[PDB]
Coordinates of C-alpha atoms in Angstrom, one line a residue:
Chain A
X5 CA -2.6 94.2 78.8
X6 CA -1.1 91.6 76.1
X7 CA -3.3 93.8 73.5
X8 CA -2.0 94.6 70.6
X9 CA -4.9 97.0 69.0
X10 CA -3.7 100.8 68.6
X11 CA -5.8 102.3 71.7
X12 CA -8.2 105.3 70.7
X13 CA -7.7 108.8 71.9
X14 CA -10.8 110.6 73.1
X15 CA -9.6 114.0 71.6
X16 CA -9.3 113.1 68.2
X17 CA -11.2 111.1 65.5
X18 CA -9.5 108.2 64.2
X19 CA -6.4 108.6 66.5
X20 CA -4.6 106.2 68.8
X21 CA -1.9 106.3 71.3
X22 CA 0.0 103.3 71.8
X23 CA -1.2 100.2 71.9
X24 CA -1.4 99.1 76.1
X25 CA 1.0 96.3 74.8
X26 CA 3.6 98.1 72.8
X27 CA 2.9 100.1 76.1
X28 CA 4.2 97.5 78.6
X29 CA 7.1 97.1 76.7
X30 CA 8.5 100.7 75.8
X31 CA 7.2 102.6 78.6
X32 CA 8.3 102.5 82.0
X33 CA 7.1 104.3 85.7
X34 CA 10.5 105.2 86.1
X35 CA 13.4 106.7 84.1
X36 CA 17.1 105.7 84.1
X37 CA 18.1 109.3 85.3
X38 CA 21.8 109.4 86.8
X39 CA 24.7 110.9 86.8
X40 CA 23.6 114.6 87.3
X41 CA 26.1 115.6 89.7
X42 CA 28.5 118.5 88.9
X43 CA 30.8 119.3 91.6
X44 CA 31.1 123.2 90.1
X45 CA 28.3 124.0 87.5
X46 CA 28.5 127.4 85.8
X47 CA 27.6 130.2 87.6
X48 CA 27.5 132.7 85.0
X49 CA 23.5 133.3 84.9
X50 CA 23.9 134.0 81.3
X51 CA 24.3 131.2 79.0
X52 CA 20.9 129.1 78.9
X53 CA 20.1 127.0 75.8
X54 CA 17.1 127.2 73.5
X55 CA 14.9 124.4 73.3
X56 CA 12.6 123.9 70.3
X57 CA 10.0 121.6 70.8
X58 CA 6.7 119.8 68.6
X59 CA 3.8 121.9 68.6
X60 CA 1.6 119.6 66.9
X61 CA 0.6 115.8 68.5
X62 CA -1.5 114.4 65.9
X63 CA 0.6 112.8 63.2
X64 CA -0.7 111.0 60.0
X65 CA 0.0 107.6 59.2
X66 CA 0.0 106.3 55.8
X67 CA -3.4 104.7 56.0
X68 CA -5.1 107.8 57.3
X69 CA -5.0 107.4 60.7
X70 CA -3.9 109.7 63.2
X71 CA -0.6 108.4 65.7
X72 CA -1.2 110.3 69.0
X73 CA 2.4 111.6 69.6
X74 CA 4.7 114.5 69.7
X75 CA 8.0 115.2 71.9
X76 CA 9.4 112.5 74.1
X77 CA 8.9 113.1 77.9
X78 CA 11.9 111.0 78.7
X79 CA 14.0 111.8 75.6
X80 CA 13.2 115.5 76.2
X81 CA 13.4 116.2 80.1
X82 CA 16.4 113.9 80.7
X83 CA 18.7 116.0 79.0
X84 CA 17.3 119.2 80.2
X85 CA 18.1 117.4 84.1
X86 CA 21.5 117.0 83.6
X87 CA 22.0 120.9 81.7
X88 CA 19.7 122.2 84.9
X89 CA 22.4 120.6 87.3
X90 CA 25.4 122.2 84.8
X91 CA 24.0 125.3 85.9
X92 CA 22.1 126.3 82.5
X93 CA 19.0 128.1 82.0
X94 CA 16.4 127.4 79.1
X95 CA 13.6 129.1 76.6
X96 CA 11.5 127.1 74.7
X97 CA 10.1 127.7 71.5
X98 CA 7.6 125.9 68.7
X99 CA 7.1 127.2 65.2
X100 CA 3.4 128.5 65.7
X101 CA 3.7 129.6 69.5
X102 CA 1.3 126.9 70.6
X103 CA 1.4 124.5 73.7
X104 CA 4.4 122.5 73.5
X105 CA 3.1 118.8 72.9
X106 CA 4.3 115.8 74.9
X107 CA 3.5 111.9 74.7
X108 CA 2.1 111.7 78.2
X109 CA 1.7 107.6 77.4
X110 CA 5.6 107.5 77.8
X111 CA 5.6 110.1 81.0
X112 CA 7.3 107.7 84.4
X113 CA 4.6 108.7 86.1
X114 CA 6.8 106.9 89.3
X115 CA 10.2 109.4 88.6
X116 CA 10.0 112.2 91.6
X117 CA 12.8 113.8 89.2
X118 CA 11.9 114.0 86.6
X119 CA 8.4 114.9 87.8
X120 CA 10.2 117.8 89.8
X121 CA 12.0 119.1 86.6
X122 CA 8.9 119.2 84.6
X123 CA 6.9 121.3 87.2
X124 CA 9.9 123.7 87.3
X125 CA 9.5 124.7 83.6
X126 CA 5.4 123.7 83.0
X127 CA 4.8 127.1 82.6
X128 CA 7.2 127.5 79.6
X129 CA 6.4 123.9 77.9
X130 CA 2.7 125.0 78.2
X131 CA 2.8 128.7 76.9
X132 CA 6.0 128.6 74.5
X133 CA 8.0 131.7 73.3
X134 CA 7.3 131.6 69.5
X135 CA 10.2 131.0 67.7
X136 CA 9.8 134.0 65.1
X137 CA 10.4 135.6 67.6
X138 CA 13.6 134.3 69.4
X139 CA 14.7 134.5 65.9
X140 CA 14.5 138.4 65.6
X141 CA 15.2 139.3 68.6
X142 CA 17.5 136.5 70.4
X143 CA 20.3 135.4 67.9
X144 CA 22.7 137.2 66.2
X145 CA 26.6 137.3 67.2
X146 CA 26.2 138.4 71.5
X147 CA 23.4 135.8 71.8
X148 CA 22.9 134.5 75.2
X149 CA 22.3 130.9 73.9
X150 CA 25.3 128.7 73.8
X151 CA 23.3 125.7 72.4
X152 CA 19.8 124.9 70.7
X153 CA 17.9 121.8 71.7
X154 CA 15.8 119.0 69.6
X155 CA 13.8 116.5 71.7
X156 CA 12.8 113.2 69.9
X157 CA 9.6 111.8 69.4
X158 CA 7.5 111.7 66.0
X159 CA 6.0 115.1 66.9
X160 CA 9.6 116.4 65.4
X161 CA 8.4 114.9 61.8
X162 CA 5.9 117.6 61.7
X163 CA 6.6 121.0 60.8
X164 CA 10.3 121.2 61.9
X165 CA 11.9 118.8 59.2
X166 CA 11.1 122.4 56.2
X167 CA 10.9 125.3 58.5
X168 CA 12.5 128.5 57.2
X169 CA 13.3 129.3 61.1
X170 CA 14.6 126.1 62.4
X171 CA 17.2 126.7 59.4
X172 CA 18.1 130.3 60.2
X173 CA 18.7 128.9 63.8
X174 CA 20.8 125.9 62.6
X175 CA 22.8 128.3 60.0
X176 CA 23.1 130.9 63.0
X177 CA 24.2 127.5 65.4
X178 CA 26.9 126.7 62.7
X179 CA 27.9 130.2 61.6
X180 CA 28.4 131.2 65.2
X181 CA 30.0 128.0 66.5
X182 CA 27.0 126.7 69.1
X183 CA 26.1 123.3 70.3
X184 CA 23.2 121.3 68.4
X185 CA 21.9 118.7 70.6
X186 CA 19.5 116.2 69.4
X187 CA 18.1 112.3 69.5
X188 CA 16.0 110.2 67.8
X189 CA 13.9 111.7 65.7
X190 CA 15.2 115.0 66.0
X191 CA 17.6 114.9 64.2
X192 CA 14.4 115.5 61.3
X193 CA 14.7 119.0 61.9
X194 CA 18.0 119.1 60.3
X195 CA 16.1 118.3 57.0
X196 CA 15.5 122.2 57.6
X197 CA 18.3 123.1 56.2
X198 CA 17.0 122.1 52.6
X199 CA 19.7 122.2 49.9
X200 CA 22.2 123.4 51.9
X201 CA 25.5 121.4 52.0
X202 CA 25.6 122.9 55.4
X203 CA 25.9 119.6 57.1
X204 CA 28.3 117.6 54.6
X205 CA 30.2 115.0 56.4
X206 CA 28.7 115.2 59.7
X207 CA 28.4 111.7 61.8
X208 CA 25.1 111.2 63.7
X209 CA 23.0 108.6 65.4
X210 CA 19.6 108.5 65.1
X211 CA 16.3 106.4 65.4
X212 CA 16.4 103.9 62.7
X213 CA 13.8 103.8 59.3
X214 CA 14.2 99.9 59.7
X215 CA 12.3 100.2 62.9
X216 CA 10.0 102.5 62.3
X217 CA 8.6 100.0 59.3
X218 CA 8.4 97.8 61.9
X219 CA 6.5 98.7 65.5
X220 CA 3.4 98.9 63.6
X221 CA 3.3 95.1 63.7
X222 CA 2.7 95.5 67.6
X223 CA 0.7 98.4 67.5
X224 CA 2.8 100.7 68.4
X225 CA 1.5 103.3 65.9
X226 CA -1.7 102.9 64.2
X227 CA -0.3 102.5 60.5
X228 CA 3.1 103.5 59.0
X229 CA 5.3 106.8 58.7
X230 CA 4.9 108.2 54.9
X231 CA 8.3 109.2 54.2
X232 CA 12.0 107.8 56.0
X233 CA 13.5 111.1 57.6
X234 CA 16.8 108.5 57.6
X235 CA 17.2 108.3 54.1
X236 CA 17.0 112.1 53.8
X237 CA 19.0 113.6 56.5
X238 CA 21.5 111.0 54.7
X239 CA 20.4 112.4 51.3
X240 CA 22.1 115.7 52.5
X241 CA 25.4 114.7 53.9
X242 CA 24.7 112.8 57.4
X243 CA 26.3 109.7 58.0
X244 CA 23.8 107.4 60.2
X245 CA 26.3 105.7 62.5
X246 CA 23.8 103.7 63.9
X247 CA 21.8 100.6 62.7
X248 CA 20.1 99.9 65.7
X249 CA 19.5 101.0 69.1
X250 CA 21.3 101.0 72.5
X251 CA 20.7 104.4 74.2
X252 CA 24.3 105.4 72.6
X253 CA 25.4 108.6 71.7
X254 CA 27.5 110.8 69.9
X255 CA 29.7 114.0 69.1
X256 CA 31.2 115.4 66.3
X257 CA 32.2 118.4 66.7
X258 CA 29.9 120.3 68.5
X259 CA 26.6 118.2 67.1
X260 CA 25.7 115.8 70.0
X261 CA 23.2 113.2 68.9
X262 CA 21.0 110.2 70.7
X263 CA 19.6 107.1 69.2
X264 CA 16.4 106.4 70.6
X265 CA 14.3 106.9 73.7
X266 CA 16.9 104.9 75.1
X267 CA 19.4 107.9 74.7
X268 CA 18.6 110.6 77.3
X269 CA 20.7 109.9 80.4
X270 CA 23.5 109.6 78.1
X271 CA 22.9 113.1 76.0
X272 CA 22.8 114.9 79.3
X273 CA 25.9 113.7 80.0
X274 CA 27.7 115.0 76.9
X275 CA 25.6 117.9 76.5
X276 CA 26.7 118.9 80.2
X277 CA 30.7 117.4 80.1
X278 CA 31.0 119.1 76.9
X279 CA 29.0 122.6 77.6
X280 CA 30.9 122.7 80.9
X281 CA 34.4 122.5 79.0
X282 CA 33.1 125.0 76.7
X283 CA 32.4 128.0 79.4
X284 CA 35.4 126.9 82.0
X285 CA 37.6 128.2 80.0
Chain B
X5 CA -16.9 114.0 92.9
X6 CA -19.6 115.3 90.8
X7 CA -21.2 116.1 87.4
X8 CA -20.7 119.7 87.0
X9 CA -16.3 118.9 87.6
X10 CA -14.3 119.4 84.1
X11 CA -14.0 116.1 82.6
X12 CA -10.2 115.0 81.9
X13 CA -8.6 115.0 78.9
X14 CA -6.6 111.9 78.6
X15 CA -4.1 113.4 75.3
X16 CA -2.9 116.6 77.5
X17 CA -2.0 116.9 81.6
X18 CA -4.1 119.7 83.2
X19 CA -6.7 119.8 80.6
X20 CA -10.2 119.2 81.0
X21 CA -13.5 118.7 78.2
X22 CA -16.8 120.2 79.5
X23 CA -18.3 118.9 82.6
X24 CA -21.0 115.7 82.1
X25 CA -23.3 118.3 83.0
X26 CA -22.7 121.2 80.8
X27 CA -22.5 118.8 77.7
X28 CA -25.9 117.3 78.5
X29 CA -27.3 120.9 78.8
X30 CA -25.5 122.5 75.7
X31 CA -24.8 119.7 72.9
X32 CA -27.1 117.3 71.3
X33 CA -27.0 114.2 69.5
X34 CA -28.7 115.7 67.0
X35 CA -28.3 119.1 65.0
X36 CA -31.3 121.6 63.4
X37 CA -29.8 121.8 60.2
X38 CA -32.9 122.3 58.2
X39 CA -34.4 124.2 55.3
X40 CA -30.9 123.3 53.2
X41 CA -32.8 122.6 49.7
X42 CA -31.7 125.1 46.9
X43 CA -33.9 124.5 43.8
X44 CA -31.9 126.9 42.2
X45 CA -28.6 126.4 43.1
X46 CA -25.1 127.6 41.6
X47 CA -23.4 125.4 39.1
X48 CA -20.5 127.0 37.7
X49 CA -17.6 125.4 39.8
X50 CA -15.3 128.7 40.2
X51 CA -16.4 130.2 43.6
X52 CA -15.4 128.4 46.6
X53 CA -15.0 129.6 49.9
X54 CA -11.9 129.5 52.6
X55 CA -12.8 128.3 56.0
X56 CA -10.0 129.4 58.3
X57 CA -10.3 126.9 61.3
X58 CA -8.4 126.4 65.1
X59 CA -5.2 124.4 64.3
X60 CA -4.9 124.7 69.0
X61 CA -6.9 122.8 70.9
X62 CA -5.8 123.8 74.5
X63 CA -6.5 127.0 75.7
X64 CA -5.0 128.8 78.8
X65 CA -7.6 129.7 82.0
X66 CA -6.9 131.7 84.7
X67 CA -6.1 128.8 86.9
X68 CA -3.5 127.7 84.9
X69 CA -5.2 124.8 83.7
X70 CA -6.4 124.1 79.6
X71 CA -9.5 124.0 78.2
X72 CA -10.0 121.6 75.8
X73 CA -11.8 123.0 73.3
X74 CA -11.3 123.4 69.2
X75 CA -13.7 124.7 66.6
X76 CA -17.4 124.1 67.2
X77 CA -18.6 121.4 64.5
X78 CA -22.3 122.6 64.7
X79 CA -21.4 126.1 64.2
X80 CA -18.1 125.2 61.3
X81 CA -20.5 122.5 59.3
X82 CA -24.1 123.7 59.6
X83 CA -22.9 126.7 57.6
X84 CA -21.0 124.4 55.2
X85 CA -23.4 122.5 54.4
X86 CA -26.1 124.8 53.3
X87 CA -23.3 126.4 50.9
X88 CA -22.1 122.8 50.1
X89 CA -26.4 122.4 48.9
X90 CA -26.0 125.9 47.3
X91 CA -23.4 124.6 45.0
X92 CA -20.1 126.2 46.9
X93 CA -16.9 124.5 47.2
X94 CA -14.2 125.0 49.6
X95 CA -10.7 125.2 50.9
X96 CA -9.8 125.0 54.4
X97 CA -6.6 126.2 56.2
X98 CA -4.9 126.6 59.4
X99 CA -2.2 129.2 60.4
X100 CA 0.3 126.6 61.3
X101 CA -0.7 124.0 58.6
X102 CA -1.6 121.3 61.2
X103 CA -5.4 120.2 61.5
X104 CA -8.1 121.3 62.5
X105 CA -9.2 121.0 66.0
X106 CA -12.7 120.1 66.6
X107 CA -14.6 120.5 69.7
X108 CA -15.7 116.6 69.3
X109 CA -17.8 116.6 72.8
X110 CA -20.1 118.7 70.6
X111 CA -20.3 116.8 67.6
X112 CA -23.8 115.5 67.1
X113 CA -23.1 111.7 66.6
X114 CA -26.4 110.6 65.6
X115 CA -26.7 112.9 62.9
X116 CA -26.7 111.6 59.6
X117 CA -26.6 114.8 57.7
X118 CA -23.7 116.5 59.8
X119 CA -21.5 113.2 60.3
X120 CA -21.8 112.9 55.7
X121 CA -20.7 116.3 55.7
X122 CA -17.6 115.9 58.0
X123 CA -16.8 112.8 56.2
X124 CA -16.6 114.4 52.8
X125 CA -14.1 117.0 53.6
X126 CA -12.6 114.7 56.4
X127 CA -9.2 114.7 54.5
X128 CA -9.3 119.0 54.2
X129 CA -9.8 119.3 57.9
X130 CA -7.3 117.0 58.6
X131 CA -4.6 117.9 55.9
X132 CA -5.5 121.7 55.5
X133 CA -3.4 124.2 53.5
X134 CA -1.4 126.8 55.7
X135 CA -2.7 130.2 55.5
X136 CA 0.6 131.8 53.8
X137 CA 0.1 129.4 50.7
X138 CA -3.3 130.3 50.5
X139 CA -2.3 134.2 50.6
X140 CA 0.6 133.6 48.2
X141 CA -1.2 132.2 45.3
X142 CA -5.4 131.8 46.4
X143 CA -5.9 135.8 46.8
X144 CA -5.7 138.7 44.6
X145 CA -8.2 140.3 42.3
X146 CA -8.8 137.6 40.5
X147 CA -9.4 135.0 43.6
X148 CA -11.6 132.2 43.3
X149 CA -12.8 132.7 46.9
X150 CA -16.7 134.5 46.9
X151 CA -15.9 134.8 51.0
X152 CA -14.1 133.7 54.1
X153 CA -15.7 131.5 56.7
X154 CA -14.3 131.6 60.1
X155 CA -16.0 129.1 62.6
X156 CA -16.6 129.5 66.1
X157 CA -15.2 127.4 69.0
X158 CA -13.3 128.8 71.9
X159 CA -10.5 127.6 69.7
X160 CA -10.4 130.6 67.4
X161 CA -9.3 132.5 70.8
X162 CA -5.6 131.4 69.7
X163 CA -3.4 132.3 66.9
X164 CA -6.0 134.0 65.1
X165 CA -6.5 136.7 67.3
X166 CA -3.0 138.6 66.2
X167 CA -2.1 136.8 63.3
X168 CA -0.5 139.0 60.1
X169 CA -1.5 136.3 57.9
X170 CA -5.1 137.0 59.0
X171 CA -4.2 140.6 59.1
X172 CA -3.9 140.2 55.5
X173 CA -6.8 138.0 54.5
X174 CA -9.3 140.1 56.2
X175 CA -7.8 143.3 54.4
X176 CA -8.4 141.2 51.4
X177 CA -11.5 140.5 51.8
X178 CA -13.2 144.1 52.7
X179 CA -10.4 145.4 49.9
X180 CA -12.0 142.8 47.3
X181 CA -15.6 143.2 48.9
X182 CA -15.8 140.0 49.8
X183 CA -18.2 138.2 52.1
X184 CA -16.4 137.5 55.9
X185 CA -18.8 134.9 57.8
X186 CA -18.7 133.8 61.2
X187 CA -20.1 133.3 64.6
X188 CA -19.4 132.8 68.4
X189 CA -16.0 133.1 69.1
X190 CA -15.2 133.7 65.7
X191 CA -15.5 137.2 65.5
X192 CA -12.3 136.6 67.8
X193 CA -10.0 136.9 64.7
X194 CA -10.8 140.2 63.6
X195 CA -8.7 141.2 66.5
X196 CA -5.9 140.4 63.7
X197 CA -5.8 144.1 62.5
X198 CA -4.6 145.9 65.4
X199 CA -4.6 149.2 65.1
X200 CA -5.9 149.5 62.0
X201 CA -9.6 151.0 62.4
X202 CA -10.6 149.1 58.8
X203 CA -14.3 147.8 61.2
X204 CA -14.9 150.9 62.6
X205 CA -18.7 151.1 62.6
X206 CA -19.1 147.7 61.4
X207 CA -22.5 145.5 63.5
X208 CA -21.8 142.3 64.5
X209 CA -23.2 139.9 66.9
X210 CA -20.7 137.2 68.8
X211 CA -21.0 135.5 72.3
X212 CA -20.9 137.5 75.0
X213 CA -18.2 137.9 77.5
X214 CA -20.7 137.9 79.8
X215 CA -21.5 134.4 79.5
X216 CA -17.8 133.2 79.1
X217 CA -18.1 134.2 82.7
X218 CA -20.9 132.3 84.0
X219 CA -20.5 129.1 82.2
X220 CA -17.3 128.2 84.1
X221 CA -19.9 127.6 87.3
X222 CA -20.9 124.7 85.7
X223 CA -18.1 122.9 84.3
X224 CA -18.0 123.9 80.9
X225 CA -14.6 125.3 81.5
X226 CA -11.8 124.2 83.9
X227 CA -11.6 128.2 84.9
X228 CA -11.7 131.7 83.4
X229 CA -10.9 132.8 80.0
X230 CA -7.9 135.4 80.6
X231 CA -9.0 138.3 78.3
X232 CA -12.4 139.5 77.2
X233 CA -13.1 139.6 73.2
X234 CA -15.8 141.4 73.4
X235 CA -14.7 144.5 74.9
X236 CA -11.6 143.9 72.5
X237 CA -13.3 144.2 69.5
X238 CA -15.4 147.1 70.5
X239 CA -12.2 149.1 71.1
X240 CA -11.2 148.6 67.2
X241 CA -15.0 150.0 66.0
X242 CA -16.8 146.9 66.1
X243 CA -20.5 147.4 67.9
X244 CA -22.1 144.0 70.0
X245 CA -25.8 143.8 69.1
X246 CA -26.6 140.7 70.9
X247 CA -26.7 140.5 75.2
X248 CA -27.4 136.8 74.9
X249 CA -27.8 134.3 72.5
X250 CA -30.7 133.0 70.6
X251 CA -29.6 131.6 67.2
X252 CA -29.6 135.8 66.4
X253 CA -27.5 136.8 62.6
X254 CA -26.5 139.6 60.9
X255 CA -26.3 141.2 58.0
X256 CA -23.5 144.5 58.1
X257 CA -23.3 144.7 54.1
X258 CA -21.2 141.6 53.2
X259 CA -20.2 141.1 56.8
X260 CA -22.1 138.0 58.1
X261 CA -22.0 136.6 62.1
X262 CA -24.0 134.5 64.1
X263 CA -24.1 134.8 68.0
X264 CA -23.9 131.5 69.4
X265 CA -23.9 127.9 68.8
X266 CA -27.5 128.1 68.2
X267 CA -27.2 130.4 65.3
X268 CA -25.3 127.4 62.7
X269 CA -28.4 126.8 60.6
X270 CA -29.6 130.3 60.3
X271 CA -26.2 131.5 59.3
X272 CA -26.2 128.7 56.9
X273 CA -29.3 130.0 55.1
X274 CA -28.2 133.8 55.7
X275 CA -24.5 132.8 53.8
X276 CA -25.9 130.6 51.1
X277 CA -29.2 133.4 50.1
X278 CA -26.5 136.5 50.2
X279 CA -24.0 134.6 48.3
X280 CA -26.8 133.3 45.3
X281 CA -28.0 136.2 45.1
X282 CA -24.8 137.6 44.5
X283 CA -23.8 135.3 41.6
X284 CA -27.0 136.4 39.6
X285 CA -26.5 139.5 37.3

């Protein structure tokens, strides 16, 4: 209950979840969905929005431990709620093609909602399109995606953050004037972009390094992150707006950015508000 | 509500290990490795071998449901470590570049000898190279790999089975004339070359599909796989020797396979006597 220990994971050697108290505290039964109500969505049965999630959950920590983790269920689904309402389809992608990788820990098991979203689109979180593949085949200049989405959660750290395909979708997003959507530690991915001064000037908000060099104290992660994906998204031209947390969100131009698990409700809003004004028109 | 049910996976939702039952029947605490002394062992420090492991550890049934499986650690480090006595080093990669999955319901905890071997290359298997690397700079005519070992495990059902990376690898190897080891499952990945009729005529032994079928009436799946390797690999050339299992290898010129979990340790010996003899001119 009041423990503090990380708490073992029976798949994996020398990996923990959570620890049940860092648990009590960031986790909830419920979610703070609302909101989702759009009077006249988009009709169009074309525009649908890519969604590229973690593929991997076991991240390492820098005292070689594993932190059992990936996408977000709350920071991931939330957002897809309110788009689904907008009247939006989605795919969803990972970089290898495996099983899209949540952390259950931080699933409400108590929200009928978001429960009901989920078991709409299992199918595709649990047997991905690969993203290769969207890539040459899905894209271009008459693509039927009007946006590509991020979830948060440490399972964004891996692979993402130097993909050669997440940057040719984020080039394609900015050379073709789409919506990037992402919180918390999504915003990693952008890291794809390498030495590109693609995203120069840009404002976001995102999960702050000051906090991940901290939860470790309660267990929250078995040991600490080996790199600061704040420093570097800043490194190429980001400008964190955020120094701590309060479920806040932002847009600049078309980049629409969360905070921390705290975030979703609020992303679905301006994801949907903003998509909505973009295709009534 | 009984022994032979799949046992939950607490890291993924609708996943399941083996049944109680099925493990007590089909894993040990203990392994066989034995007969792994070579008085005349290699000592040069050059040839090394590339173990290709599962970087998935959920597999797709029938029933929608996922199998939580992984590499086989009996069958991946009874092999190693007769080559590790022989005096063989290695290098071990995934597709994606995330670890490797291990079936650890298998693992023979009270086993000295397997658990020190796991240990020593604990940091490979969990931070592996990513096969592209390895075919951009490991390969060639001048290669330090003597062979290719790819481990069994229901795991090596994914990714593997249609990779171009392992396309590529394999080509190598038969191109080079290189040893290709493996067993179970294993033989999966040789799926990888399509069309291209590079095994036809090639004896092999591997689990068979038969089985795959009957196990699930026991637990040791959560349902059915969804495609039969066996009569896969016979349509590319490859011929089945084995209609069970019984710790049976084979030799088909430098291709090397076992049949079944049971067959680690003899395909240990059969790898580490084909390989010294072939570093003695």
């Amino acid at each position: 209950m009041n423990d503090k220990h990380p708490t073992p994971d029976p798949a994996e050697d020398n990996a923990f979840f959570p620890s049940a108290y860092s648990l009590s505290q960031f986790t909830a039964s419920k979610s703070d969905l609302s909101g989702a109500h759009y009077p006249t969505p988009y009709q169009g049965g074309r525009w649908k929005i890519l969604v590229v999630g973690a593929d991997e959950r076991y991240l390492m920590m820098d005292n070689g431990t594993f932190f059992s983790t990936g996408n977000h269920p709350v920071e991931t689904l939330l957002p897809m709620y309110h788009l689904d309402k907008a009247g939006f389809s989605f795919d969803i992608a990972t970089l290898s093609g495996n099983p899209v990788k949540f952390e259950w820990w931080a699933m409400p098991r108590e929200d009928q909602e978001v429960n009901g979203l989920y078991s709409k689109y299992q199918s595709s979180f649990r047997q991905p399109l690969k993203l290769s593949d969207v890539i040459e085949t899905a894209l271009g200049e008459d693509s039927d995606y009007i946006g590509v989405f991020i979830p948060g959660g440490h399972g964004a750290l891996m692979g993402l953050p130097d993909s050669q395909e997440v940057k040719a979708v984020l080039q394609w997003a900015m050379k073709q004037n789409k919506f990037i959507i992402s919180l918390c530690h999504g915003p990693a991915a952008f890291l794809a972009v390498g030495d590109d001064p693609l995203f120069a000037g840009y404002k976001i908000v995102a999960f702050p390094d000051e906090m991940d060099a901290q939860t470790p104290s309660i267990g929250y992660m078995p040991g600490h992150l080996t790199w600061k994906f704040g420093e570097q998204l800043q490194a190429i031209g980001f400008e964190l707006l955020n120094t701590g947390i309060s479920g806040q969100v932002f847009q600049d131009r078309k980049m629409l950015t969360g905070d921390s698990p705290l975030a979703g409700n609020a992303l679905g809003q301006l994801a949907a508000k903003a998509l909505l004004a973009e295709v009534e028109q």
